[PDB]
Design a protein around this ligand. Structure first.
Ligand SMILES: *Cc1c(COP(=O)(O)O)cnc(C)c1O
Ligand SMILES: *Cc1c(COP(=O)(O)O)cnc(C)c1O
Ligand SMILES: [Cl-]
Ligand SMILES: [Zn+2]
Ligand SMILES: [Zn+2]
Lengths: 367, 367
């Protein structure tokens, strides 16, 4: 137990979350959605914690998206509901999906293939419940292309072919392609996606296919929303609760919006090479940002320094260095490239305010 | 509980370990060391499990190397002893190190700085125990260069300056630089390292510095050992228990020596792009091998296929494809680039023999 502890006191490497910053990020996204007239369904995959979920959800524990059944189960067990499995429904795991649909007032699934609908049909929920299905739109990884006649036909089938067993809740797009720098290009992807979705829904209405909801979002696009988004019903970003270096470089946020660090101690000086040795390796950071290591993290408040090497449990920093500025034992705060990836390496996050630990959040992991 | 289950039955993505292969790998390294007349101190960081430790150690639970205090504690609690913390000793965590030194018959630490020795001196163990110290030799990340006069002086200090509180057990080098392809260049690094170590120890003997042990090793060098190694006392490879694609490419092993897979299900076909969608993203694999994604894994038994994309929970495979060869629902076995990195993403390993799960191993993680 580390409650009350000063940050420089923590065992490193340590993932830290500034709760003032995270709370602010959570509330700001809630406000953007309120201003647009749309609901927020935060994706939880960046943190995978009940505590982060509670913040993102403004205390309601209702209305989230998850990336795995491990998360769906974990959040369900933590008293959340209105949980969307934002993943082509795992037809090999339908018994588990149906278990969740039966426990929850609203467990939502996505699909983009007729065979998946067929699988849902041959595993009815019973219990007076319907599979709550969203059609995933590809506007380029999963989903159906909205201009593909197949898309409209699949929507029709989801909506009307077995109204007693399955229902079409809405369409769902994830504009993951926003990960092009600049507000202008981000907003362009947002607009193509938004308009493609809106045009598809308009086609659905004309074809008499009821589609009450329409959900898009990624952190870049929801950090600089466009007015066209007010014609949707819901936005589902997730990374924004923490942000990270990549989002900062993308222009999604300012450095002050990044809640996450990895704290690391200088554990050695190697003058013959001009390097600091730190106790944060890829086990604490991941290699996200390297495709080299310089791209994986910046040192907060120290532009002079750069990561030049990562092994499992060690990192090497280079400036000509200044070894008196960085005694062995000093603590540096790394700003990670990708919060989701870095958070996935940590069994605990030390959540702080005013320099002191205020909470410990423990994420779920696995599948 | 999945004991007895057929592999195609597991929830994917699933890290699987062929126990016949792992056991064979464990026994083979033990035999190489026996043939050389040296001890084996397996490093556990590739698997971080008590079960893997028991295999590597030939059932003794004695004589391992670990990369973190989390591992030292976990293995100590699992009844292991003669545990070496193969890491410049964490002078900010000395109370924890001393706790371990006090519980264990033999907890070993490494250092390469006089200040670290000074820290050990100002935190005596008491209890009739001595800090068991190895001098880390850099023959290029941590350690002292053996030709650096400072090295000999630090060895002298460790050995003789407070014989009641601190003792020099031996010198420790990790020829991590073997990670240059080919047996010839691997063995060259092994030889430079081995000879540098042997020359340093010879210098120590001439200077009257007692140094009873001398430990080197990496998986590449211990997979093709050289006779000069018989002049050492111990070898400390670790990855070999599983091996991986990188070691296969390095020539350390044959494909048949790789015990580890990540099983993944085909979850979609996207003909308009010629791609299979699988349920293994970087959350199950890591991005090791990308610095792109094609380098992170091969598909076992399917040279035709290649990873072209990884998101957190999805992967994209490309051949012109053949969608009938790979129905949605089929299970493919990914051979990961770096076992250590992939294993760090999994809360459980499904260990199998003759196609069926035989054990579940749960690794420790964190710091
Ligand atoms: C990650 C994800 C989101 C949230 O996007 P971010 O840009 O990470 O905030 C929404 N939908 C899906 C399907 C996702 O995978
Ligand atoms: C990883 C490691 C080893 C084991 O080396 P492998 O090539 O991974 O088998 C030995 N010593 C140290 C210090 C290590 O970090
Ligand atoms: Cl990674
Ligand atoms: Zn992300
Ligand atoms: Zn490794």
């Amino acid at each position: 137990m580390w409650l009350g502890a000063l940050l420089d006191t923590l065992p490193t490497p340590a993932l830290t979350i500034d709760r003032t910053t995270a709370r602010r990020n959570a509330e700001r996204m809630r406000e953007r959605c309120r201003a647009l007239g749309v609901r927020l369904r935060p994706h939880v995959k960046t943190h995978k914690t009940l505590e982060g979920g509670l913040l993102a959800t403004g205390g309601t524990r209702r209305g989230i998206a998850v990336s795995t059944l491990a998360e769906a189960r974990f959040f369900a067990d933590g008293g959340f509901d209105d949980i969307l499995l934002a993943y082509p429904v795992p037809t090999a795991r339908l018994e588990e999906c149906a278990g969740l649909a039966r426990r929850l007032d609203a467990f939502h699934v996505l699909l983009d293939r007729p065979e998946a609908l067929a699988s849902l049909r041959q595993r009815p929920l019973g219990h007076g419940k319907r599979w709550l299905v969203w059609l995933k739109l590809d506007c380029g990884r999963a989903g159906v292309r909205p201009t593909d006649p197949a898309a409209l036909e699949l929507a029709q089938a989801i909506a009307n072919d077995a109204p007693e067993e399955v229902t079409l809740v809405g369409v769902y797009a994830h504009c993951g392609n926003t990960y092009c720098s600049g507000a202008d290009t981000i907003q362009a992807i947002a607009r193509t996606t938004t308009n493609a979705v809106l045009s598809f829904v308009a086609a659905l209405r004309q074809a008499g296919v009821p589609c009450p909801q329409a959900s898009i979002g990624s952190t870049p696009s929801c950090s600089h929303p466009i007015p066209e988004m007010s014609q949707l019903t819901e936005l589902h970003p997730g990374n924004y609760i923490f942000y990270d270096l990549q989002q900062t470089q993308l222009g999604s946020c300012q450095p002050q919006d990044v809640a996450i660090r990895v704290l690391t101690r200088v554990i050695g000086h190697y003058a013959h090479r001009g390097q600091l040795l730190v106790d944060c390796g890829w086990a604490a950071l991941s290699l996200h940002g390297a495709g080299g290591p310089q791209g994986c993290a910046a040192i907060d408040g120290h532009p002079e320094l750069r990561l030049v090497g990562l092994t499992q449990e060690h990192g090497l920093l280079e400036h000509q260095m200044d070894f008196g500025r960085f005694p062995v034992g000093s603590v540096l705060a790394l700003i990670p490239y990708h919060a989701c990836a870095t958070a996935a390496m940590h069994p605990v996050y030390y959540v702080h305010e005013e320099g002191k630990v205020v909470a410990l959040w423990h994420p779920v992991r696995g599948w």
